[PDB]
Amino acid sequence: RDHRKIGKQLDLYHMQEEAPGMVFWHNDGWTIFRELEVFVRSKLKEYQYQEVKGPFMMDRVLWEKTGHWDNYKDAMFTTSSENREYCIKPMNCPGHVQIFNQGLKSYRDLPLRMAEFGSCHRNEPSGSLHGLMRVRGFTQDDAHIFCTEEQIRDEVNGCIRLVYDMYSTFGFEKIVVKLSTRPEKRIGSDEMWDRAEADLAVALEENNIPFEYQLGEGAFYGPKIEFTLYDCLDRAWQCGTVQLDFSLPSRLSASYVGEDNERKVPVMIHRAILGSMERFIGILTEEFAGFFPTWLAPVQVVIMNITDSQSEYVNELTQKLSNAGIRVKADLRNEKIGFKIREHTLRRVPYMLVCGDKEVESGKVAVRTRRGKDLGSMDVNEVIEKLQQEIRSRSLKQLE
Amino acid sequence: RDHRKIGKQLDLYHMQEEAPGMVFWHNDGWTIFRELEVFVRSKLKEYQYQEVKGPFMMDRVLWEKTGHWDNYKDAMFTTSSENREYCIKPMNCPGHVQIFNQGLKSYRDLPLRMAEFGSCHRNEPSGSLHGLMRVRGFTQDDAHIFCTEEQIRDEVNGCIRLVYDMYSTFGFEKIVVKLSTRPEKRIGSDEMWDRAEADLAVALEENNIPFEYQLGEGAFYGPKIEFTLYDCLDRAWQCGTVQLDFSLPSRLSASYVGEDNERKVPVMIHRAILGSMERFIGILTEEFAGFFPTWLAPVQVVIMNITDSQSEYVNELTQKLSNAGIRVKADLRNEKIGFKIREHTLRRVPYMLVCGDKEVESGKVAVRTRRGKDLGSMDVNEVIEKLQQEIRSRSLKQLE
Ligand SMILES: *C(=O)[C@@H](NC(=O)c1cccc(O)c1O)[C@H](O)Cc1ccc([N+](=O)[O-])cc1
Ligand SMILES: *C(=O)[C@@H](NC(=O)c1cccc(O)c1O)[C@H](O)Cc1ccc([N+](=O)[O-])cc1
Ligand SMILES: [Zn+2]
Ligand SMILES: [Zn+2]
């Protein structure tokens, strides 16, 4: 149950000293990553987010306007061109505010939700690096919500719902929640902090989430909620964050015209659910020990012959399943059927399809799961439909 | 017919002096971009490529092993961490060789086809920058094919087919092809250059492509084929490239076990079809003058009411088309119908659905195209079918 070993075994990714803390995603790991992308994007549609893409580097002058340069310059990668300094982005928030600043906005346009699978880079100390979980380059399931003060509590609600929707998809039901209150050095008045912390507290109350305070741990520009999921070994993983921000939009001249036709600065909410997706793939690898749910498995089906008397029946079925959008391969090698099955069982393929002449003539397939339960011979059309239903529903469990 | 003007009008992207030559994709531009990802990915499945992802930055020591540092150091962004120098990748090729170098390779594994949507960054002089077309940061529809010398012809064939397949989808039918022959300073023997030049020449000959030589214009490590498409204004756009490489894999220690059990160095084919995807979106924007085919339109359908007495029929219709995978939005605003319709015609929405009492009771919609043609009241399920078919087939033409 160690993702670095499973990662090498299943050929998912590798890393090397020429690029410390930066992942090389091989075909099969990248398939997991992209399947996560598709799932998140399905959520962005359902919860009505825009998806944008910002540039990898911006002028360091801009990073000073944010105030982040003064605090976290050392975690930043800088480069040069024509006598200007640029930083490679460690976060997506200012870029999103830059998208927001194009075109006059109106209260009509808020809440405005803006997501990005944003590639970030942080100059992490090399000795702290570890596999997929402490890296220098990661991708974040990142969104920012611009809204009015009246819309905060409804927008946080939506984020809270999103969190439990997505964690439960992976079997994570034990979640611990913490609210981080005002730190010693902060901006804003005590009254503004009073209602900011109240909005986060009330949102969790309307959702029936018990929670607990992390006193003084809040950012200098707002409180936050932090979500911690527990894996099947009862290790805690902080993944989710909803973070209120009353400083950045004003620092970057974001404004909208209000109901009263006066100019107003929007509230910004920062939220990620998986957090860093390389890290989340790491958790999943260990939570599942490599036996990924069908919808995540790099290879969902392998089809095998008994003799060469079925090689083309296999090939036609491989094609048939592929047209159904199933990641399927054929194993027509001249090896014993128990050799092939161990090969693909070691590779954690969810379903092994075997065709003898017994089943070639009837139009069926014999079906074996990776755990070793034999489901016998079923009609191909019924097998394909049952596979699709399992994939579309992102089922954690296989057939029976 | 200028993409930069159209780009601001349709709210596709923007750029700013804080990040010269780097694109901010807004929601509507990023929809186009992502839809091109899905189209390329459809082809990657059909032509059987792996899709991988390499790290964004790599040790400059590795970039010296490739020989690219001597020639192209001035084009590279470089950065420091703990007293090591790193280049942001201007290209994906060395990263893919790193992926190939994990695990011993046998001749059985070739041809190995490896694609990536690679984020590259080149320190282009700022005075040369222009729109989406000459930039500092861009994404490439990249792939590398590792094969044996006996396998080159069939692989180049496969690349030549893919080029004509994709360009055809967009309506580019006039394509000019040029073969760059050996340069004055080069690696390899004349005998090997003779077979390599003939390899590219034979592959085009088998696919009936006439072509022309670009004498002496080859890279020092191989000949190439370059494809130039002509747009509807009859301007020439060089997009596709097929580069044979007989130097890089040996310099980076690639090797396989041959069928004679002697270890050999593989051939690399470098291969891009659209080239820079930003640039391609720019060409498409000018090629269509913003009237994107339905499968690329950021918003495919707008539904509208006559009065308020249909606001809910519109809303259920909107959800009904959303579930069908159609990018549809509803316009329930209190405005005249000719005002709404002009609004969405200026935005180049392909289809405009309108609902009064007549269509609500009947379960139909009045359908209007952006050209201005009325298609009348057809059944809702028949117009969803026709939209799906037009989208799935990536048709350039609309209904009728
Ligand atoms: C303050 O805003 C805080 N942001 C977040 O924690 C955050 C969470 C989830 C999504 C988004 O978009 C967020 O911004 C601040 O960015 C924290 C921070 C700590 C360290 C570094 N660093 O460069 O090592 C950057 C930002
Ligand atoms: C030599 O290999 C040449 N590559 C290509 O032309 C190429 C075309 C399409 C796809 C791929 O993957 C390719 O590698 C070489 O890369 C030429 C070149 C490299 C770097 C720069 N630079 O501005 O740093 C310019 C040209
Ligand atoms: Zn943020
Ligand atoms: Zn290349």
Short mmCIF file of N, CA and C in Angstrom, two decimals, chain A residues 214-268:
data_model
loop_
_atom_site.label_atom_id
_atom_site.label_comp_id
_atom_site.label_asym_id
_atom_site.label_seq_id
_atom_site.Cartn_x
_atom_site.Cartn_y
_atom_site.Cartn_z
N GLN A 214 -10.28 26.07 14.53
CA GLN A 214 -8.82 26.10 14.54
C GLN A 214 -8.42 27.54 14.82
N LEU A 215 -8.26 27.85 16.10
CA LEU A 215 -8.23 29.24 16.55
C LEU A 215 -6.97 29.97 16.09
N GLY A 216 -7.17 31.15 15.49
CA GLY A 216 -6.08 31.98 15.05
C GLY A 216 -5.38 31.53 13.80
N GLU A 217 -5.77 30.38 13.24
CA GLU A 217 -5.13 29.76 12.09
C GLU A 217 -5.58 30.36 10.76
N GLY A 218 -6.43 31.37 10.79
CA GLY A 218 -6.98 31.90 9.56
C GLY A 218 -6.00 32.76 8.81
N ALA A 219 -6.29 32.93 7.53
CA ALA A 219 -5.47 33.80 6.69
C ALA A 219 -5.67 35.25 7.10
N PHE A 220 -4.74 36.10 6.71
CA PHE A 220 -4.85 37.49 7.12
C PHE A 220 -5.96 38.24 6.38
N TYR A 221 -6.56 37.63 5.36
CA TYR A 221 -7.59 38.28 4.60
C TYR A 221 -8.93 37.55 4.68
N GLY A 222 -9.07 36.59 5.59
CA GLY A 222 -10.35 35.93 5.76
C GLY A 222 -10.28 34.58 6.45
N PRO A 223 -11.40 34.16 7.04
CA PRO A 223 -11.49 32.80 7.60
C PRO A 223 -11.59 31.77 6.48
N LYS A 224 -11.49 30.49 6.86
CA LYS A 224 -11.65 29.40 5.90
C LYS A 224 -12.22 28.18 6.60
N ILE A 225 -12.79 27.29 5.79
CA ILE A 225 -13.20 25.95 6.20
C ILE A 225 -12.21 24.99 5.56
N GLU A 226 -11.75 23.99 6.31
CA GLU A 226 -10.83 22.99 5.76
C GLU A 226 -11.41 21.59 5.97
N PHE A 227 -11.42 20.78 4.92
CA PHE A 227 -12.01 19.45 4.96
C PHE A 227 -10.91 18.40 4.96
N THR A 228 -11.03 17.43 5.86
CA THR A 228 -10.05 16.37 6.01
C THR A 228 -10.77 15.04 5.84
N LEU A 229 -10.33 14.24 4.88
CA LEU A 229 -10.94 12.94 4.65
C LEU A 229 -10.07 11.86 5.28
N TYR A 230 -10.71 10.77 5.69
CA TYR A 230 -10.02 9.64 6.28
C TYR A 230 -10.10 8.47 5.32
N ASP A 231 -8.95 7.85 5.06
CA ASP A 231 -8.88 6.70 4.18
C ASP A 231 -9.18 5.42 4.96
N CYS A 232 -9.20 4.30 4.25
CA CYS A 232 -9.51 3.01 4.87
C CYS A 232 -8.47 2.57 5.91
N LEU A 233 -7.37 3.29 6.10
CA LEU A 233 -6.42 3.00 7.17
C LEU A 233 -6.50 4.03 8.30
N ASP A 234 -7.50 4.91 8.26
CA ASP A 234 -7.70 5.99 9.24
C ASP A 234 -6.53 6.97 9.29
N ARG A 235 -5.88 7.21 8.16
CA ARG A 235 -4.98 8.34 8.03
C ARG A 235 -5.75 9.56 7.57
N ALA A 236 -5.42 10.71 8.15
CA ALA A 236 -6.10 11.95 7.81
C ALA A 236 -5.42 12.62 6.62
N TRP A 237 -6.23 13.10 5.67
CA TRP A 237 -5.73 13.83 4.51
C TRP A 237 -6.53 15.12 4.36
N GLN A 238 -5.89 16.26 4.61
CA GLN A 238 -6.53 17.54 4.30
C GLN A 238 -6.56 17.70 2.78
N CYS A 239 -7.77 17.80 2.22
CA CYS A 239 -7.93 18.04 0.79
C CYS A 239 -8.70 19.31 0.49
N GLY A 240 -9.88 19.48 1.06
CA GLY A 240 -10.75 20.55 0.63
C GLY A 240 -10.50 21.84 1.39
N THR A 241 -10.76 22.95 0.72
CA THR A 241 -10.62 24.26 1.34
C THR A 241 -11.66 25.18 0.73
N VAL A 242 -12.39 25.90 1.58
CA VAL A 242 -13.17 27.06 1.16
C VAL A 242 -12.63 28.25 1.93
N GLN A 243 -12.14 29.25 1.21
CA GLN A 243 -11.36 30.34 1.80
C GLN A 243 -11.94 31.68 1.35
N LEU A 244 -12.40 32.49 2.30
CA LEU A 244 -12.95 33.80 1.98
C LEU A 244 -11.85 34.84 1.89
N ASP A 245 -12.04 35.81 1.01
CA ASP A 245 -10.99 36.76 0.67
C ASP A 245 -11.61 38.14 0.52
N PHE A 246 -11.21 39.05 1.41
CA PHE A 246 -11.65 40.44 1.40
C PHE A 246 -10.51 41.40 1.08
N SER A 247 -9.41 40.90 0.53
CA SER A 247 -8.23 41.71 0.25
C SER A 247 -7.81 41.69 -1.21
N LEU A 248 -7.69 40.51 -1.83
CA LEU A 248 -7.15 40.46 -3.19
C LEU A 248 -7.98 41.25 -4.19
N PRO A 249 -9.31 41.14 -4.23
CA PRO A 249 -10.04 41.87 -5.28
C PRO A 249 -9.83 43.38 -5.22
N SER A 250 -9.72 43.94 -4.01
CA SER A 250 -9.44 45.36 -3.88
C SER A 250 -8.00 45.69 -4.24
N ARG A 251 -7.06 44.78 -3.94
CA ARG A 251 -5.66 44.97 -4.30
C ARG A 251 -5.45 44.99 -5.81
N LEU A 252 -6.38 44.40 -6.58
CA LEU A 252 -6.24 44.26 -8.03
C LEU A 252 -7.35 45.00 -8.78
N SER A 253 -8.03 45.93 -8.11
CA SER A 253 -8.97 46.85 -8.75
C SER A 253 -10.15 46.13 -9.42
N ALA A 254 -10.62 45.05 -8.79
CA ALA A 254 -11.87 44.44 -9.19
C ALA A 254 -13.05 45.24 -8.63
N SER A 255 -14.04 45.51 -9.49
CA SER A 255 -15.23 46.24 -9.08
C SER A 255 -16.44 45.78 -9.91
N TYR A 256 -17.63 46.02 -9.35
CA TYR A 256 -18.88 45.87 -10.09
C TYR A 256 -19.79 47.03 -9.72
N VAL A 257 -20.78 47.26 -10.58
CA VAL A 257 -21.80 48.29 -10.37
C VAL A 257 -23.00 47.64 -9.70
N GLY A 258 -23.37 48.13 -8.52
CA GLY A 258 -24.37 47.47 -7.69
C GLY A 258 -25.81 47.82 -8.05
N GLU A 259 -26.73 47.17 -7.32
CA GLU A 259 -28.16 47.44 -7.47
C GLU A 259 -28.44 48.93 -7.35
N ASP A 260 -27.73 49.61 -6.44
CA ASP A 260 -27.83 51.04 -6.17
C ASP A 260 -27.02 51.89 -7.14
N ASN A 261 -26.46 51.29 -8.18
CA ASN A 261 -25.67 52.00 -9.19
C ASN A 261 -24.41 52.65 -8.61
N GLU A 262 -23.95 52.21 -7.44
CA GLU A 262 -22.65 52.60 -6.91
C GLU A 262 -21.62 51.50 -7.18
N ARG A 263 -20.34 51.88 -7.11
CA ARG A 263 -19.27 50.94 -7.40
C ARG A 263 -18.88 50.17 -6.15
N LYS A 264 -18.68 48.86 -6.30
CA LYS A 264 -18.44 47.98 -5.17
C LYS A 264 -17.36 46.96 -5.53
N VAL A 265 -16.59 46.54 -4.52
CA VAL A 265 -15.58 45.50 -4.66
C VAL A 265 -16.23 44.14 -4.39
N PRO A 266 -16.02 43.11 -5.21
CA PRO A 266 -16.66 41.83 -4.93
C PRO A 266 -15.91 41.07 -3.85
N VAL A 267 -16.65 40.21 -3.16
CA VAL A 267 -16.06 39.20 -2.29
C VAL A 267 -15.55 38.09 -3.18
N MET A 268 -14.39 37.54 -2.85
CA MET A 268 -13.85 36.38 -3.54
C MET A 268 -13.86 35.19 -2.60
#
